[PDB]
Ligand binder design. Structure first.
Ligand SMILES: COC(=O)C1=C(C(=O)OC)[C@@H]2O[C@H]1C(c1ccc(O)cc1)=C2c1ccc(O)cc1
Ligand SMILES: COC(=O)C1=C(C(=O)OC)[C@@H]2O[C@H]1C(c1ccc(O)cc1)=C2c1ccc(O)cc1
Lengths: 10, 242, 242, 11
């Protein structure tokens, strides 16, 4: 549930 | 503020500018694994650009990270499929997965469960052709899918969650205004405007249906291990049974 | 013929064609189980389907279609139609779904059916959207008719493309009727197109719920929780779950 | 077989 979170910040 | 102040022409310009590129597949005969491998490899690469496009959809960066994550988890396959359908418009009977992976129905469906989905995608593409969907209209519809698909599945009941949903509904109304503007510009009557707008939005029901079916196929492929689903893909897929 | 009806005559016909609200066989002598709750809902749905078939025959344009096309549209849309009905009946019962007048349930109650509470939460969400928008009954019967004609339209030799065109013309009349209602209700021109879009985008969420509904019903059928009527088995089979 | 729905559509 976190790779997407990471792409959104990145 | 930023997105609710744009003119219809500026909305359209912003959405056109934010469009992601067409990606290539890999450069002889196919199999079941090799076919879905190309499509999953592709989808995975397209997802990375989709996130960057979402950030440029006016209104989207006003939302919390949680909410942007939820919208993308809900919308992603609908967004990939509307792109595919759009791309395939000028290719009756074929899906342009990438410029070098133009696939017919006539192609001996090596993937099991794929034909019903293909057929639905083709009929949508034929519908957009019949309608003469314009690029400016397409970018509006794709932004509506992003913003709409997850909007009612916000089960959060607080004052920060209603102000947020009202903001997404305000942005959605703006995209509606923008669609109407395009149709007025094109010289459609008021009666033709309302009819066309309905026509386009009813296609989104069909796109949702295709995504729902597509997702079930994907989860059942996950459980086979004959295809290498990427880490991000596993997570997006996880979100539909979670 | 349907295309020569005025807006007012369209609304009159649809209000008149409304099926009755039926009672559940709810037996308050015993506690609920998974099987008993699912038995109640399937028995209700099965009785409601017979009235729906008779309602569909009264939707303008529907009887002009061949029996095969009528069958397809109802097979595609039946659960969507039951669900929009339910959300409608539930509007003025915040937190509760009014399946029947003697079967008014909150989310806790059907947590007793595995995988049901997810669907229940979506249905309550929709009912809340309708309440908030203040959906009117005349608007509701147009939306229900749009679902019947639209959901299966894109999955339809030469008789094919006059049958598809007839449907799209009737759908355009229902848009005209929606806008007319909104105008008579005093909405501005911009408010008219914004509300039309808001209502039609809800149909994507209804499709979604129906898809999730159908997969749950299939899983119930496949775990031998409840016996389904021969009619429900066939309607469920048309969705060809796997 | 003759689908149940197809028959109900005639009554
Ligand atoms: C059996 O065929 C199906 O699994 C699918 C599709 C269909 O066969 O044609 C689109 C479609 O939905 C899936 C799919 C897809 C396949 C693999 C993925 O990792 C992600 C998406 C699809 C896909 C859609 C768009 C896109 O840009 C890439 C893949
Ligand atoms: C128990 O949770 C779920 O399996 C369902 C629904 C939902 O949980 O309602 C909150 C809903 O979709 C099903 C359902 C239904 C359940 C059994 C059937 O034979 C047919 C439909 C439904 C149904 C919907 C409307 C209606 O008039 C009758 C049944």
């Amino acid at each position: 549930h976190k790779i997407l979170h990471r792409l959104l910040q990145d | 503020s930023l997105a609710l102040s744009l003119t219809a022409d500026q909305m359209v310009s912003a959405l056109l500018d934010a469009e992601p590129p067409i990606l290539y597949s890999e450069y002889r005969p196919f199999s079941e694994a090799s076919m879905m491998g190309l499509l999953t490899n592709l989808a995975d690469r397209e997802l990375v650009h989709m996130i960057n496009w979402a950030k440029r959809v006016p209104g989207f960066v006003d939302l919390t990270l949680h909410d942007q994550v939820h919208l993308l988890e809900c919308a992603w396959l609908e967004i990939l499929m509307i792109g595919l359908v759009w791309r395939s418009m000028e290719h009756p009977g074929k899906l342009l997965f990438a410029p070098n992976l133009l696939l017919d129905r006539n192609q001996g469906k090596c993937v099991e469960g794929m034909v019903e989905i293909f057929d639905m995608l083709l009929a949508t593409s034929s519908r957009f052709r019949m309608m003469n969907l314009q690029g400016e209209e397409f970018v509006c519809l794709k932004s509506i899918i992003l913003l709409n698909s997850g909007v009612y599945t916000f089960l959060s009941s607080t004052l920060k969650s209603l102000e947020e949903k009202d903001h997404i509904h305000r942005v959605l109304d703006k995209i509606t205004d923008t669609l109407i503007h395009l149709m007025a510009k094109a010289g459609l009557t008021l009666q033709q405007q309302h009819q066309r707008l309905a026509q386009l939005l009813l296609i989104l029901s069909h796109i949702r249906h295709m995504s729902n079916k597509g997702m079930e196929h994907l989860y059942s492929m996950k459980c086979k291990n004959v295809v290498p689903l990427s880490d991000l893909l596993l997570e997006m897929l996880d979100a539909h049974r979670l």
